[PDB]
Each structure stands twice: as C-alpha cells, then as structure tokens.
C-alpha cells in the first residue's frame, strides 16, 4: 500500500480518522490505466519490465537509485497491476500488436460468394462470448461501431466511480456525528446528479437491451434526448419507453427543487440555534458542485480518447514498418525484415509503451486527485513523522 | 513604416475604387453577395465550423494553460507546495477543449451525404450556416474563456504562493469566468437545435 | 443567372481557404520570430569584487 | 459530374499537407524554446541534462499526430473525388494543424519554464511534468476530431 | 417563390446569434480579467477587504446574460420550415450588433474601474460608496444595447 | 442471445464477493478485502458493458476487399 | 421588389439602427473610464469631494441616452416595404449621431481626468472644468439635432 | 429619368449631411480637448487667468457650428428623385466644411494649449496668441465659404 | 479538356520552385543563426571549432530535402497534364518547404545557444546533439509526406 | 490567339527572366554591404590581413553570376507565340534561382562580417569562416540546378 | 570616389529609357510591351540595390 498510499499523499494530508484515499486507489489507478492503455501485447512488455524489479528487491533497496530509477523502483507494485490490468483490458479489447486473436466463432457470416470487389455485409448469425468480435477487423466501418462502444464505456465507468467516492460523504458523515450534513449536502447532492447523469446510464444499458428492429420502432439518440430534457422540455423525438414525457418533466424538475434545497437548509439550521460565514461558503460549494456535475462526467471521455489514439497509432506504426518487409522474398529481404523488425520493436517499445504509458498514467492520476476526491476528502491535515 | 497598415490601405483603395466604378457603369448589382451564398456548397459551411470549433477552443486552453502555468512554476521554486493545490486552474483552462469535442461529436452526426438534385435547397442551405456559425460562436467563446480563466489561474496561484488563505477567495474568480463557456456551449447547442442532417 | 466567368463559386471557395490558410501561417511565424536566447546563463564574467 | 467536379482535389491535397505544415511549426516552437532553457540550465547543474529532455520529447510527439494523419487523409485522395470528401479532408487537415500549433507553443513555453526552474528546487520536476501532459492532450483532441472525422469520408459517396 | 424571403436569409440571422454572444463573453471577461488583478493586488496586503471588492466580478457577469438572452430569443425565430424574410435576418443582425458592442464597451469601462478602485481601496475606505456608483453608471451601457435588441427583436419577427 | 446471462454472471460474481467477506485473512484484512471484491467488481462491469451493444447491434461490418476462399 | 423599394433596403437602416449605440456606447465607455480613473486617484486624500467630482461621469452617460434616442427613433420607421431614401437618411442618421457621440466621449474623458486631478489642489478651478465641459457636451447634441432633421424626412412624400 | 436621376442618388447627399458634423465635431472636440488640459494645468497656481484662458475653447467651438449650418442647408434639399449631380454637390459641400474643420480644429488643439502655458509666466503674450488662433480659425471659414458656394448649385439648372 | 484545363500546370511548377525555396529560406537561417554563435565563441577555444561544426551540418541536410522534392517533381511536369497532378505537385512542394522552414528555425536556435554553452560546459555537447536530432527530423517527417504525395500523382489519371 | 498558347503567355517569361536577376542582385547586395562593414571595422587595426577577407564579398558576387546566366537562359527562349506552359516554367525557374540566391546571400553576409571580425582576433578561425561560407554558399547552386533542369524541360513536345 | 560610383548607376537606367522609349508605338505588340516592362524592371531594381550596397 506504500506506493499508492504515496501517491495519494501527494495531493493532500488527510483529517483525522477520515476515510483514506490510498485504500481504494490500489485497484482504480491501475485499472482507469488499462482503459486508456488497451493492449495485450503491450501489457506483457509491462509486466515483464515490471518484474525485474520485484523478483530483485534486495539487490535494489540498498543502492542509491537516482530520482528516476527511485521512482520507478517505489511504485513498482503500481507497473505490476497496471500490466496485468493491460492484458485483461487488451483481451477485451481484442488486439494484440494492433492484431486480433481469433479463438472463438463469430458472430457473424459472411454471404456465399461474391466478386472479388464487392462491399459485402455479415449476417448476425449469434453473439461473440468475450470481448469484442474478431469479424470487426478490417471492414471499413471499424472506427464507426468501435468508439460508440468505447463512449458509452467510459461514460459508464466515469458514473460509477464517481458515485462510488460520493457514498464515503456519507461514511464520513456518519461517523463523525454530522447529520446536518447528509440532510443538508449528500441528500440533495445525491438527488441531483442521480436524476440527471444517472438516468443518462440507465438509458444506454436500456436501449442495448432492446431489439429496435424486431419490434419495428427507430432507436432515439441519447444525445439528443439528453439535449431536449433541459433546452426543450416536453417534446420526445422517438419514445424509448412508454411514459417517456411524464419521467423527463418530473426529473427535470426534481433536479432544480435541489438547487433551494441545497445552499438553504444548511445554513439556516445555523441561524436556527445568515452569518456570511457559513451563506456564501455555502453558495460557492452549491455553484461549485452543480457545474462540476457535468464537466467532471465530461471529464471522463479521455479514457475514450487516448485509447482511440494509442489504438491507432499502434495500428499505423505495424502497416508502415513491420508490414513492408512482408513482400520482399528473396535474399535481401531477409536483411531488410531484421532491419524493419528492429525498427518496429525499437519504436514500439520507446514511443508506444513508454511515453504513452506516462501519458496514460497521469490522466488517471488526475481523475483520481480531481474528479474522486472532490466528493469525499476533505483536505487540509497534518502529518504525523515523529522524533 | 507599418507594412500591414499599408496593405490594409491598399486593400481598402482597390475596395472602394471597384465599388465606385461598378455603380458609375451601371453594374451594381453584379456585385451579389447573396447569389454567393446559394451557389457555395453547404458542406464548405459545415465544415469549416466543425473545424473552427474544434481549433479555436484548443488554442484558448492552450494559451490560458500557459499563462498560469508560467506563473505556477515560477511561485513554486520558493513555495513548492502550491503546484498540487493550484492544479484545478489548469483543469479549468482543459475543460474549455472538451466543450469542443462534445461539440464536434454533436455536429458531425449531421454530415451526411446529399444528393445531386434536392442539393441548394432551404434545409440543406439551413443546415450549412447553423454548423457554421455554431462552431463559430462555440470556438470563439472558448478561447475567451480559456485567456480569461488563465490569467485569473496565474494571479490566484500569486496569491496562494503570497498567503495560503488567499486562494479560497481568488478561485471565486475561476467559477466566475468558467461560467462563460458554458454558456458559449449552451447557445451553440441551441443554435444547431432544429437544424436537419444533409437529407 | 451565373455569379461570374471569372470569379465562380468554385475558385472563390479555393480563395477562401488559402486566405485562412495564409493567416494562421502568418500569426504562426510572427511569433516564431520573436523568439530569444537569454545569452547572460550561457557565459560568465570576472567580477573580482565578487 | 456537377457532384464532384475538377478543383474537389485540390481541398484534400491541401488538408493532406496542412496536417504536417502546423504540427511541425508548432514542434519547432516547442523543441527550441525548451532546448535553450535546457542549454542555459545545464552549464552549471549538468547532472539533470537527459531529466529535462522530456519536454523536447513531448514536442516531438504532436509531429508525429499530424504525421499520422497526413498518412490517413492522403490514402483517400483521388481524381473523381467529391466536394464531400474533399471538405471532410480539408477539416481533418484544419483540425489536427490548428490543434497541434497551439499544443505545441504550450508546451515549449511551459517546459522553459519548468526547466528554468527545476534547478533551484528540486520538487518542480513533477509539477513541470503535470502542467506539460494537460498540454499534450490539446493536439491529441485534434487527433481524434480528424479521425472521428475520417471515419466517414468515403462509404456511400457517387 | 417568395421575393421578400430569399434562401439566403437565415445566414445573418445566425450572424446576430454569433455576435450576441461572443462579443458580450467578451465584455463580460475584459470586465472579470482586469478587476481580478487589482482584488487579488491588494490581498498580500489586506486580506481582509476581498469579500466586500467582489462587486465588479458580479457587475461583468450580468453582461453575458443580457447576451445570452438576445441570443435564446434570436434562435427561437429559426427554424428551417417557416417563412423567415431578409427583414428579419436585418433586424436579427442588427440585435446582436448592438447586444454585443454595448455590453464590450461596458465591460472595458467596469474592468478599468474596478481595477483603479480596488487598488486605491486599502488606503481610503471611504471611497467604496463612489466605486459602486460609477460602477452603476458603467453597467447601464449594456443595458441599452439590451433594449434596443428587444425592440428590434419584436420588431422584425412580423 | 439472453440478456438474462449478464444477470446470471452478476448473481454468481455477487456470491462469490459475500463469500469473500468472510473468508479474508486476517492480518492485512482490509487490503484483502478492498483489493479482491472492489477488482472483480471492475473486471464483470468491463465485461458486461463489452457482451452488451453486441447482443443487439445496429450496424453490420463491410470488408470490402476479402479474398473469396 | 420595387425598382424603387428593392429587398436589401432594410439592410441600411439596420446598419444606421445599430451605429446609433455602438459608437455611443465606446465613447460614454471612455468617458466614464479615463474620469472615474481621475476620481479613484484623486478620492484617496480627499474623500469629501467624492460627490462632486463625479459630474464628468453624468456628463458622459447623457452620450449614451442620445443614441437610445436615435435609435428608439430610427426603428419604428423600419419596415419591410420601405425605399432606398429612407435606409440611406437612416444610414446617416445613425452615422452623424454615433460619431459625434464618440468625439464628445473622447473630450469628455480626457478633460474629466484633467480637471478632476486638478480641483483637489485648487477649489476655484471646478467651475472652470464645469464650462469646459460644456462646451465637449453640446457637440454630441449637434450631432443629435442632425440626426432628428434628417429622421423627420425619411417617409415624408415618397413612394 | 433613371438616366440622370438614378435611385442610389442621395446615398451620396446623405453622407454629404453626416460628415459635415463628423469631422468638424473631431476638430472641435480636439481642440477642446488638447488647450483644456493646458487650462487646467495652468489655473491651479493662478486661477485669476480663468476666464482669460477659455478662449481657446469657444474659437474651438464655432467649428461645430459651421458643420452644423451646413448639415442643416443639405439636409433640406435631400430626396428621393434627386439628380446625381445633386448628391454630388452635396458629397463636396460636407467634406470640404468637415476636412477644413477638422484641420482648423488640430491648429487650434496645439497653439491653443501653449499660449495658455506660456501666459502665466508671461503677460504680454496673450494678445500674441489670439494672432495666431485667428489664422486657424479662418480655415474653417474658408470651408465653410466653398461649402455655401457649392450648395447654392445643386439644384439651379437641374433637370 | 475539362480534366486537363491550360492552366494546369501553374500549381505544378509553383510547387517545384516552393520546394527549394522555402527549405532553402530555412537552411540559411539555420547556418547563419549557427555560424555567428560558432565564430563568436572560437576567438578563445579554436580547438572546438570542427566539433562545433555540427549545427551548420545538420542545417544543410533539409536543402537536401528540398532538392530531393523539388527534382522528383520536375521530372512529372508536362503540357498537358491533369489538375489533380497539379494540385499534388503543390502540395507536395508546399510540404516539405514549409516542414524544413520549422526545422531550420528549430536548428538555427538550439545550435545558436548550444555551442555558445558547450564552451562552459563540455558534458552539454552531447545534449545539443540529442536535441539537434528532434529538430531534423520534422524536416524527415515532410520529407515522407511529400514523396508519399508524390506517388499518387500519375496512378490513376485520366 | 489559339487556346493552348494565349497572348498574355510572354509575361510569365518576362517576370520570370525579370526576377532571377533581381533578387540575386539583392542576396548579393546584403552579402556585399553587410560583410563590407565588418572588413573595414577590422582592417584598421590589422591592414595585412585585407586581401584575406575579401573572400565573403567573392562569395556573394558569384550568387549575381547564376541569376545572369539563369536570365540570358530564359531570354533566348521568349516568343511572341509561346505557350503557358513555357511561360510558366520559366517564370518557376525565375523565381527558384532568385529566392535561393537571396537566402544565400542573407546567409553569407551574416556569417561574413562575424567570421572576419572573428578570424583577425584568432587567426585559426580563417578556415571555419571558409567552412561555413562554403555550406551558405551551396545552396544558390541548388537554385542554380534547379532551375537549369527546369529550363531544360520548357520546349519537349510543347506544339 | 563613392559619389562618382553612385551616379554612374544612374547613367545605366539613363540608357535603358532612352533604348526603350525609341521603340514606343500606337501598334504595338504585348510581346514588346512585355519585353520592355521586364528591361525596365530589370535595369532599375539592380540597380537599386547595388546603389545601396
């Protein structure tokens, strides 16, 4: 826990008898990681540079290291659960070096036959068990069914980790005998990004599990309905559900009973047993966590991002290096793919493992130092290091 | 000897003196800036928007994370300790390229393809200068926002350098002028709102 | 009912882009050309006073 | 064909070369502006010289986006081509050169800056190096519009 | 068809939303930039007296609701199935023009002011009574454009 | 097919976390029981949001070149 | 369209509705700034001529009240149907008023400052700056005189 | 007569009324401004020369009443089925008054303001100084003549 | 003929000369920025002077570059060729002008305050090549964008 | 005349052969003043050393050398009835050999006055101003070949 | 010295537009009109910078 526990020092001290940041950090750091870090082959790279240096502690710990060999020797726990959450992340993803792995049947089938041309379609002929299909390869529409996936996953994720943090409020709360601050600040807190982004969750795992050609309807933008819930209230493009108008009028409208309900009761409760220092700090905390709701779930589309550009880069780097020496036989192709392979590897593991595995590790590390503990630490402590 | 301002004059020499002799041949009307618009293909209009979105809103987070990031180091050789409690200034400067990404993501579900006949007509024209002057006003906002809160970044993390009971009342100051894009948002939502894709 | 022979709605589109091309090249370069050294960390004086 | 017609190309081949102009024009700002701070830092602390060499990295990386993209736009330029794929071709281009010559000019400033700085106290390494990866994404944003972009350039196109 | 209602006449229309609301954002950060330096100014020296200088930071932020409501009610008026004139896209134009140039140059006058008030405030403090009066008669100019768009806004949508 | 496999795997993945919170060692027994429940937790939601938008899709691949073998 | 009442007419009295507040609100926006910095910096040794040093800020919101006239004015002669005649008076209207309001805001401002600096060491000197003061005032007034001669003959006797 | 009286005539008449009191309100605001901020400089040690010293701003201000006799003699000949020769009389009559005015009024902005600096520490030189203000004034009288001279053609044999 | 317009081969001849022009343009600031720090700083250590003959090297390889293009594209013209030849010509051209524009600025700066730094510390040397090497190669990167432009010109012409 | 050889065709040539002496002549007059200064700041102090630093001013008069034969190239191959491919090649030509040789001799003048001031002070700096000029001095000969290749296409099969 | 060199770069454009202006005509081609802008353009911006120098 040393490491993590190291990282989330970093940030701030915690108060005492709080709730620790570090406990929680073990396994979300690492795994915000794999996210934006999707790959199988380079997750392997990982854990193997991972442990050779925790297979040799002993040799390392009574050496001077030199503050970057020391970082990378203190946080090597960190390296270790980051690569193993890469192969498990890559699996799902389905690339191993921007290759997929073909080790279950498809999905879907191709027609019979057709002329060596022709923009052919599948058929949908079953479900892929684990991952995604591995008929989604190549097929000039890769880029258009793969990030609607990956947009909605980090939307997903982004929600649950966010109302994860938000219950340890109330477990603080609890704890320290405030019950002004639940009915004051998490009831109300808890009501508004429910009824708003939480029913945005609700409706894309909804609308995946409805067949809207089966039954014959159009399936709704969820961007659009999100959009007409609050600039054009009432009106419905395409129904998702039966009593769609009634629920997006009362949740609209629960939503902004929160806004007097927060920055008020607080308050008063003080002036009931106002005093400016407890009004407008009370203000700045309502305007600072109505406006933090929706970019800090916005926020959370770089998990989308990066994983889109370290794909894709990792993809442009195998058919411009690696792939031009496949069709050089004779003899001075086989110079010439040591050479490209070489310069694949090279590439690869400087530009694609290091310094995007630096980038991807410190989003990660500012989703959890902004958009986590802005719901739950409460900041300012002091630290114990005795005599 | 202001170069640039003698192109400008140039510029507004020939300007004026085509004007006059178009008007003194009898030709004004050749001149017709509205028969411009309805020739000019609407995906032009489309997207340069989009485009223009997404740029313009980068460059504002880019310039206000520099101008409080300048000022964040240079507090920090003396006062370490301000670099954790002044990140949420950059993070306000970086949210202003996500509003431009949501906003290139809601647009670009509207580029689709139109065909030969049914090309010019009121939609298709409709839906070529809503993109365009959406992205625009979106991008235009953003990057004000993103200087703004970049200059109230550095000068708050001054202050928390100066006194670290500073910084609760300087960052008062941020959520006031973050305030600004969203609303650059709310209104380029609002103006592609009844806008139709290219049918 | 053409706009012109020689000014069409396809070399105006053409002039349009290269014009805001040449704009952001030319802010682009202005300020690469203000661009300095700070020579006084890259040498040393004697000062014998000091 | 009034649907694609002879001067279409010209709005891809110069999309094609905007991507490669700006994002080099943009790591040329941060590759010198951060390497004269490193010149003038390490002439008496010469011990941190390949620690500050991470923002003249991190510069070079946005040569590479606008790299990757001149490759992805030029693959789908021909002769017959639309005024559709034309324009989407020019916005990738515009987006991902707009987006990596800001990025670019951030990160040079910032890692002067951060370079400068990390002689005397020793703990702005880390803050140097989180203030320049908020300044990394920026041309990384436009990366992803001009692929979310490309994705639909030519599928259902006459 | 209809000569008065060209095809072209939702351009200006949009034209006056674009102007509505970037040049009042504009106002409304000149007014919230420039008065921030002088409030955070005089804080090493008095901390004390922050709370009550946070008056120029409200006064420029109600100039970007004067544009964002002449934008909201401009935007209703379009739609791309009714009938929408060249008048109205004039008068639409002419809405956000003024919206956006009076609430510009009030925002540059509310920034002077609160700038020079705020720092001359630690050493008088009897001078606060005479800021916020000049700040009321610099606020006022966004309010005029404000009207004068509401006018020409019910005016030209008949 | 089956919507109700997410709900079933959900089922059995809750039963073995329950099942975890009384079986944890006890020397570091807050680190095995964080560490353990809350990534399996992460691991079913990662695979659940992956089998899902694949059981009902809305668009179908192309691969227009594909040697006819 | 008429040949005398074309379709782009409105444009003009659009240019001439908005020229009325734009460039009177830049020059009561100068005005009040290069005064109230004068005052600020003045105010701070003699807080009790606060309230009568502020005149040069009253003289220069009166510039601004004049273009909301013109412009209140200017917009209930704009139509649909309207000629040429009538955007280009508009047109000029607009212009006379809103440049005249900037000149006046400039003079306003610049001797505001001037004479608000001054007064704290001279109690003889404001009357001085009162009539100066006059004088930089009526000149938007000219242009306002200008402005409503030329709006009362922008719909008589046409067709 | 689309021929010699064509519809976009008395666009040029109506900036014909417009910069006549545009630019002969930038002079007269100028100076104003430039010898206002001599005066007050000057009436702090010696506020006796306070009414001596404001005659630069009246000389100043008769220049925006010249703009505004001619603004005020073109405006009412203005119409809508008026000759292009009209309109351009009219062009030439403003910016002859308003150039002329606006010169008259830099010249009387700049030695304006050094003769009220130089009159404190000596006397003798105001009656010297009024020499001068009056070559700058009759500028704008020579303006304003051409102006009249102009305007009493416009419609004389005008078919 | 409406695919091979008079006109046609304008942009490819503009992009023959922009090649060499703009790499040219580059190459000499690069030498001169360098050459002044070189013989400003070799008055006291003449021993240095062929290693610190680098920075003036590396600024010669991008007219190398610019040559390179500038050859492959004028054995492609002709009187009658395409627009579509015409418009990749340019941009080609316009590629790699204005990518070994940036690297030379690029190398012209860091070997200006890199030589002039290697004279107090000799452990620096190996630092200016470490970055003088980002700098050549966004030259490099225009440089694979021009020729991989340039062989789309004449495939499927018509 | 004809479609494919207009009349307006010799212009491009004559701008073309215009140009390519022209701005040689300016590279060479930077190269010649700007090293000329620091030849005769130097040779005060040390007269001996003069016929060795005249070597940048031979080194900017061969960049006037190759836009002169570039430019009697081009003559000899204008015509009344050329066609606007000819002329277009010649106009590239013009102006590749003209900016190349401008950009050398902005280079070779910079590298010019500091390498003579440098090499009096040092007299083992005389080899590295010959170095860096000879690396300043290539790239007009890039010019050069690239505008003789494309004057030598110009007339293949050009009818 | 140098004053007599400047002014015998004078007597070089004196020549061109004596030489030029004995070839004027009504009738006259583009190409001659071409031919004599480019003489003219040529003998005057040399000569303005080997003035300068």
Redesign the interface.
């Known amino acids: 826990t040393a490491g993590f526990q190291s990282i989330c020092d970093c940030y701030g001290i915690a108060q005492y008898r709080e709730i620790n940041a570090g406990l929680p950090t073990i396994v979300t750091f690492p795994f915000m990681f794999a996210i934006m870090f999707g790959d199988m082959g380079h997750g392997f790279l990982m854990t193997l540079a991972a442990l050779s240096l925790v297979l040799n502690e002993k040799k390392i710990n009574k050496m001077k290291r030199g503050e970057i060999f020391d970082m990378a020797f203190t946080g090597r726990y960190i390296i270790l659960l980051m690569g193993v959450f890469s192969m498990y992340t890559g699996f799902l993803y389905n690339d191993i070096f921007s290759k997929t792995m073909t080790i279950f049947k498809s999905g879907w089938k191709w027609p019979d036959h057709w002329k060596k041309g022709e923009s052919i379609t599948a058929t949908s002929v079953g479900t892929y068990p684990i991952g995604l299909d591995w008929a989604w390869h190549g097929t000039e529409n890769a880029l258009l069914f793969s990030n609607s996936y990956k947009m909605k996953l980090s939307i997903l994720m982004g929600f649950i980790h966010m109302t994860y943090s938000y219950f340890f409020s109330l477990a603080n709360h609890l704890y320290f005998n405030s019950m002004i601050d639940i009915i004051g600040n998490f009831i109300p807190g808890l009501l508004f990004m429910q009824g708003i982004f939480g029913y945005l969750s609700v409706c894309i795992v909804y609308k995946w599990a409805v067949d809207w050609v089966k039954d014959g309807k159009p399936a709704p933008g969820l961007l659009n309905m999100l959009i007409n819930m609050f600039l054009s209230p009432g009106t419905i493009d395409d129904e998702l559900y039966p009593h769609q108008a009634k629920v997006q009028v009362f949740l609209l409208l629960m939503a902004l009973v929160c806004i007097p309900w927060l920055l008020l009761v607080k308050p008063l409760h003080f002036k009931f047993t106002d005093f400016g220092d407890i009004m407008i700090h009370q203000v700045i905390h309502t305007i600072e966590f109505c406006l933090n709701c929706v970019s800090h779930t916005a926020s959370y589309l770089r998990l989308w991002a990066l994983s889109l550009a370290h794909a894709q880069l990792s993809s442009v780097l195998w058919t411009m290096t690696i792939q031009i020496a496949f069709g050089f036989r004779g003899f001075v192709g086989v110079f010439m793919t040591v050479a490209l392979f070489a310069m694949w590897f090279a590439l690869t593991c400087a530009v694609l493992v290091l310094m995007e595995g630096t980038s991807a590790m410190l989003h990660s590390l500012r989703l959890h130092w902004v958009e986590s503990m802005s719901k739950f630490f409460v900041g300012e402590g002091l630290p114990y290091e005795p005599f | 000897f202001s170069f640039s301002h003698f192109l400008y004059y140039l510029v507004l020499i020939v300007v004026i003196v085509y004007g006059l002799y178009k008007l003194f041949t009898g030709h004004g009307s050749d001149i017709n800036f509205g028969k411009f618009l309805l020739r000019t293909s609407p995906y032009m209009w489309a997207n340069l928007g989009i485009a223009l979105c997404v740029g313009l809103s980068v460059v504002g987070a880019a310039w206000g994370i520099f101008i409080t990031g300048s000022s964040m180091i240079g507090a920090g050789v003396r006062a370490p300790r301000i670099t954790t409690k002044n990140l949420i200034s950059i993070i306000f400067c970086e949210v202003v390229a996500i509003y431009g990404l949501i906003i290139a993501i809601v647009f670009s579900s509207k580029l689709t393809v139109a065909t030969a006949e049914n090309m010019y007509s009121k939609s298709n024209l409709y839906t070529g200068y809503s993109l365009f002057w959406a992205g625009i006003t979106v991008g235009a906002s953003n990057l004000i926002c993103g200087i703004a809160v970049g200059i109230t970044g550095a000068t708050a993390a001054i202050s928390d350098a100066a006194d670290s009971a500073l910084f609760v009342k300087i960052l008062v100051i941020e959520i006031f002028g973050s305030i600004l894009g969203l609303l650059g948002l709310i209104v380029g939502l609002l103006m592609a709102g009844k806008a139709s894709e290219f049918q | 009912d053409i706009l012109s022979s020689i000014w069409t709605e396809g070399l105006l589109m053409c002039l349009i882009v290269s014009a805001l091309l040449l704009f952001i090249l030319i802010v682009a370069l202005s300020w690469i050309s203000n661009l300095d050294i700070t020579y006084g960390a890259l040498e040393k004086s004697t000062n014998p006073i000091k | 064909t009034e649907l694609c017609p002879v001067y279409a190309p010209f709005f891809g081949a110069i999309g094609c070369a905007s991507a490669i102009i700006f994002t080099s024009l943009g790591a040329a700002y941060g590759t010198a502006k951060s390497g004269v701070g490193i010149c003038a830092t390490c002439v008496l602390r010469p011990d941190l010289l390949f620690k500050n060499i991470v923002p003249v990295i991190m510069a070079g990386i946005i040569a590479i986006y606008g790299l990757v993209v001149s490759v992805l736009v030029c693959y789908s330029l021909g002769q017959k081509q639309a005024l559709y794929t034309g324009f989407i071709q020019l916005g990738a281009g515009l987006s991902v050169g707009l987006s990596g010559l800001a990025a670019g000019f951030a990160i040079g400033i910032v890692g002067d800056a951060g370079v400068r700085g990390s002689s005397q106290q020793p703990r702005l390494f880390v803050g140097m190096i989180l203030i320049l990866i908020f300044a990394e994404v920026l041309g990384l944003y436009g990366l992803i519009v001009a692929l979310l972009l490309n994705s639909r350039a030519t599928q259902d196109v006459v | 068809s209809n ?2 209602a ?3 006449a ?2 200006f229309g ?2 006056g ?2 102007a509505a ?2 040049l009042s ?2 106002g ?2 000149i007014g ?2 420039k008065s ?2 002088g ?2 100014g005089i ?2 020296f008095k ?1 004390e007296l ?2 009550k200088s ?1 008056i120029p ?2 006064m420029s ?1 109600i100039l ?1 609701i004067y544009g ?1 409501v002449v ?2 009610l401009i ?1 209703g008026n ?3 199935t009714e009938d929408y ?3 109205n896209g ?2 639409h ?2 809405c956000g ?2 919206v956006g ?2 609430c510009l ?2 925002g ?2 509310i920034g ?2 609160g700038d ?2 705020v720092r ?1 405030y630690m ?2 403090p ?2 606060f ?3 916020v ?2 700040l009321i ?2 606020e ?2 966004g309010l ?2 404000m ?2 768009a509401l ?2 806004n019910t ?2 949508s008949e | 097919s089956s919507f109700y496999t997410v709900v079933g795997v959900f089922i059995v993945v809750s039963a073995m976390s329950v099942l975890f919170w009384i079986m944890a060692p006890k020397n570091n027994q807050a680190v095995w029981r964080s560490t353990v429940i809350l990534t399996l937790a992460m691991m079913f939601l990662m695979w659940a949001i992956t089998f899902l938008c694949q059981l009902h899709p809305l668009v179908a691949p192309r691969r227009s070149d594909l040697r006819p073998e």
């Open positions: 000569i008065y060209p095809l072209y939702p351009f949009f034209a939303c674009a609301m970037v954002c504009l409304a950060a919230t930039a921030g330096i409030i955070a804080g090493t901390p922050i709370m946070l930071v409200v932020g970007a964002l934008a909201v935007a379009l739609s791309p004139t060249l008048f004039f008068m134009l002419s023009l003024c140039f009076a140059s009030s540059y006058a002077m002011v020079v008030g001359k050493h008088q009897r001078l009574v005479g800021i009066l000049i008669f610099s006022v100019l005029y454009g009207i004068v006018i020409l005016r030209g």
